[PDB]
Homo-oligomer: A and B are copies of this chain.
Amino acid sequence: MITKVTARNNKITPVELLNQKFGNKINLGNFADAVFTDAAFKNVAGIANLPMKAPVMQVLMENSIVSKYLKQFVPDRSVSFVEEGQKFYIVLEDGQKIEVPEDVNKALKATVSDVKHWAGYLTEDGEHVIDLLKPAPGPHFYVNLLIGNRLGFKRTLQTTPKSVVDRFGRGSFRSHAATQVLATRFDMRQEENGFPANRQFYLYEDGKQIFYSALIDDNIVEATSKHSSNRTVIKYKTASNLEITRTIFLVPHKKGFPLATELQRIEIKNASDKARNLSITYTGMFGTGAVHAIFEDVTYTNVIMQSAALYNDKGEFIGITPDYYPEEFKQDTRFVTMIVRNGDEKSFPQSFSTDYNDFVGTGTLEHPAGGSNLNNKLNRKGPGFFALGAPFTVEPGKTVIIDTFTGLSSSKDNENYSDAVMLRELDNLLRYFEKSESVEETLNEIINFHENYGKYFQFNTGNKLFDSGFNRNLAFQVLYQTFMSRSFGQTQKGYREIGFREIQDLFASMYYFINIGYQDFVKELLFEWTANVYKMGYANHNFYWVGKQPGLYSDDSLWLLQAYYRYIIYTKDTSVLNEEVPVADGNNEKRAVRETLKAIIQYSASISVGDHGLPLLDLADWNDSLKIDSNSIDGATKEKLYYEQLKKTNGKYGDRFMSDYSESVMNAFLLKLAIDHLAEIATLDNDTQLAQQMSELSKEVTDRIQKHAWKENFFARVLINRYKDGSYTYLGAKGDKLSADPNIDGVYFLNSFAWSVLSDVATDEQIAIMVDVIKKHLLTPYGLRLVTPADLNKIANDTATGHYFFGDRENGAVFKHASMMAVAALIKAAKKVKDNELAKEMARIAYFMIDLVLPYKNLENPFQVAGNPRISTQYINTDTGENIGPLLSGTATWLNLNLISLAGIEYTRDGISFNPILREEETQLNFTLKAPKSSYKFSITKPVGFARMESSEYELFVDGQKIDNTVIPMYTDEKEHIVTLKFK
């Protein structure tokens, strides 16, 4: 009877039908747009020859003139618009070509004129300028991320404030952990991160509303938003010639300040020739401290608090704080306050409301009935809605400035905490910002801090979109992720702690922090992770104020050797090996870093190993969904069993934990890398015993992998040991019998390839075979997939590949973080393999993939690829090409590593191993590099074509002296050194 047609099953798209019905009567061009005219999809209305894909028919439909005109034909007749000369026609299926009326021609030309920039544009400095009326490519595209600065203060990692801001200023604002200052929204749409009133305000004249910051109507003649590094600026011009500017940023910490403050400055310039008697009403919604009760008991969230008013020394009202009854919700104290600056005079708000129902009344939030006449009623209940009102007269050509301060004080930074601490910190804050210029100076301080932070590595290529994208935007995103891990963005809203393995973010940012004098902060981060390693070598999978999930995941500890290796090789500071750091086991016990790093390797190399001497997989490793072993155990369960095994069998600590559990080949590669890392560390430490021991275990573990993990045409991913008859014995190479694609023999994991190379196990020949498999079955038009189809239920209890349509996340997406780890491999191999044609090919795939993740390139075809042109996104949908959030991802970290690696920079014990791999079409690459006691200017020139040191003639000069050593010293003479490389 009734039939069902899904979005994906729908037989034909609008543009396909448009091409069918008009393609050989008019030139539809490279891009067109169309909509079905009816719910049965039989006819289309379309428009030919657009500069790019864009929702033009949608905007045309919003236009009363074009809309009414089209009804003379649609829905019963298909039509296409077409421009010839500079005049528009409408074409029918019967060949008629009708010059459209002038008012329609004008509307159509006005609509298509700037389609090329409908998703905004980037400034030379990489700032995203956004039209507030234009449609969004996706829910992450128009988003900026803000962060405070707790460097030099306690618990910098856990207490740095962070904010989400879209083009309209919507979003929310957090202090420590997931503590909400302004309310987050957890509702149906990705686009809604915050309660809708947050950061918004209204203007009134003669009692009538003339402006709302989140409503663009006919009385708004210009409205743009600019997302820059750590601030957002939003500008409006009214038809009445008011010029309104909003600037939003987080206050860097200063002693005595609240733990979190977000400043929004509102500038109102009267660009007309008559004074205007105006008022502002500034609104927002405090987050609840009782976040779980939003789901479980909303009435609880309301009755546990009340509104309270704040008054300065002179008895003047300054703002609002939400007052809580339960002690657990009185350890943070929120506030909002406003200063109105009008020539000489400063004033505080004259009125307030705290009841959303009294505020909106019979109206809407966009048009609130009580917005002009606030009732000065303190709500006995929550929620913590606030409205602050103040009148001002602004003379012709003059500007009034309204500075708002919203934030939170906390016990997390203050002993003997009470709301009295907040009142003192708020006073400190308001006195600091008493003078108008203090706001501008603080913004400039933020700008300069990030400008100086990025000087560690600066491309200068004349592609300013690339230069700014890397030098500024990617540098900021890796800083942001060092503090925030994956815990807070537009759609990352729930209680994420800090994953042990996101120590990865520090792999890239440590060099930046060291080169602005914060080496000690990097050590504090290392020691903090070190303190989440247990005595036996496994690690808490997660930690925030406290660590948890002991040895739950098998890869965690091994990543820390990469962090220590990076730090020790760059700094040559071996002292950290002697630091006494808490063991995660507690009871006030500390272990020297050296012995915890020796323990980490012993856990994965000797204890928690399987039948082949490879590290056990346990619940899973880096790959969230390799739950192969249904009866896994974490490291504390394994510890108690391991010790009773040793007494059962009379064994010795260090013996293999006997089991039939599966093994992770990826952990084997991580371990092998770890062991080489420790050997190099000990060498620099002149620890002769440890360097010999590791150098020898490295050879052993490599033997193990080569012998037991190379499987025909790939390094396998997992070795299976529970089937003594041989039913299944590996996964991740031809012949594993586990594929789920008829045309594919075997399952192939991109990371088996990547980590076999990054750990320096795979031979040139094994690289060639795996790259061929990659080209055939993992390389898509949208990049490198994480894995090929597998049917893992053949050995385990499902709940993995069963959740997503093809193209999303685990059902075959391009996971950009994994794609970047693979690029890191391709780049490492391209520098070293003997076969220059293999190297050329791998460098081609590297740059192909980098081009598909570079955020600024999202503006080339934004309504198809979406993403965000300043901030990385997690994955690409391989069905559509859409870059899909979230906005925090190891993609950014490894992209940074990879581009610096391709520029030729690798730090080794003896200095900088210089080996750049330029693009074939490039003929020069210039960049600057800071070091702690020197700097460098690098210049590389080459003919068009593939050039690399391994296989191309070259001359290398350092400070004008041709040299042969391609390891450039790490200079300490506080001079700039000129490095020139010339390929023939």
Question: Which A residues fall within an 8 A CB radius of B?
Answer: 1-10, 35-41, 55, 57-58, 61-62, 64, 67-68, 75, 133, 135-136, 183, 185-191, 195, 207-208, 215-216, 285, 288, 294-304, 306-313, 315-318, 321, 323, 325-327, 349-352, 356-358, 361-362, 364, 366, 369-370, 372-373, 375-380, 382-383, 385, 419, 423-424, 426-427, 491, 493-494, 802-805, 808-809, 880, 884-886
Contact B1 A61 (CB under 8 A): no
Contact B215 A364 (CB under 8 A): yes
Contact A58 B6 (CB under 8 A): no
Contact B379 A7 (CB under 8 A): yes
- Closest CB of chain B to A208's CB: distance in Å? 8
* Cα of A64 to Cα of B206 in the assembled complex, Å: 10
A190: chain B residues within 8 A (beta carbon): 298-299, 302
Known: A1-B423, A8-B380, A311-B5. A373 touches B325 (CB 8 A): no
Contact B37 A294 (CB under 8 A): no
- Closest CB of chain B to A924's CB: distance in Å? 41
A207: chain B residues within 8 A (beta carbon): 64, 67-68
A-B CB proximity, top 9 nearest: A39-B317, A7-B378, A61-B373, A36-B376, A188-B383, A7-B306, A6-B308, A2-B423, A1-B427
* Cα of A321 to Cα of B327 in the assembled complex, Å: 47
* Cα of A2 to Cα of B36 in the assembled complex, Å: 62
A185: chain B residues within 8 A (beta carbon): 187
* Cα of A185 to Cα of B196 in the assembled complex, Å: 14
Q: How many copies does the complex hold?
A: 2
- Closest CB of chain B to A136's CB: distance in Å? 7
Contact A803 B1 (CB under 8 A): no
A186 nearest CB neighbor, chain B only: B295
Contact A294 B40 (CB under 8 A): no
Known: A186-B298, A191-B357, A349-B39. A6 touches B378 (CB 8 A): yes
- Closest CB of chain B to A6's CB: distance in Å? 4
Partner of A325, one of B362, B372, B804: B804
Contact B375 A318 (CB under 8 A): no
* Cα of A827 to Cα of B885 in the assembled complex, Å: 64
A294 nearest CB neighbor, chain B only: B186
* Cα of A261 to Cα of B913 in the assembled complex, Å: 70
A813 nearest CB neighbor, chain B only: B303
Partner of A38, one of B215, B299, B303, B351: B351
Contact A39 B350 (CB under 8 A): yes
Partner of A370, one of B3, B61, B299, B350: B61
* Cα of A764 to Cα of B38 in the assembled complex, Å: 79
List 4 extra interface pairs beyond A4-B308, A216-B362, CB under 8 A. Answer: A1-B312, A7-B378, A190-B298, A303-B804
A385: chain B residues within 8 A (beta carbon): 188
Partner of A2, one of B183, B310, B886: B310
Known: A188-B183, A376-B38, A493-B298. A4 touches B309 (CB 8 A): yes
Contact A294 B187 (CB under 8 A): yes
A188 nearest CB neighbor, chain B only: B383
- Closest CB of chain B to A386's CB: distance in Å? 12
Contact B427 A380 (CB under 8 A): no
A55: chain B residues within 8 A (beta carbon): 358
Contact A325 B366 (CB under 8 A): no
A372 nearest CB neighbor, chain B only: B67
Known: A5-B378, A216-B362, A361-B58. A188 touches B301 (CB 8 A): yes
Contact B35 A375 (CB under 8 A): yes
- Closest CB of chain B to A279's CB: distance in Å? 11
Cross-chain pairs A/B with CB under 8 angstroms, 16 sampled: A2-B313, A3-B311, A4-B423, A7-B378, A7-B379, A35-B377, A36-B377, A39-B352, A41-B376, A58-B370, A62-B370, A136-B357, A188-B195, A188-B298, A298-B491, A380-B805
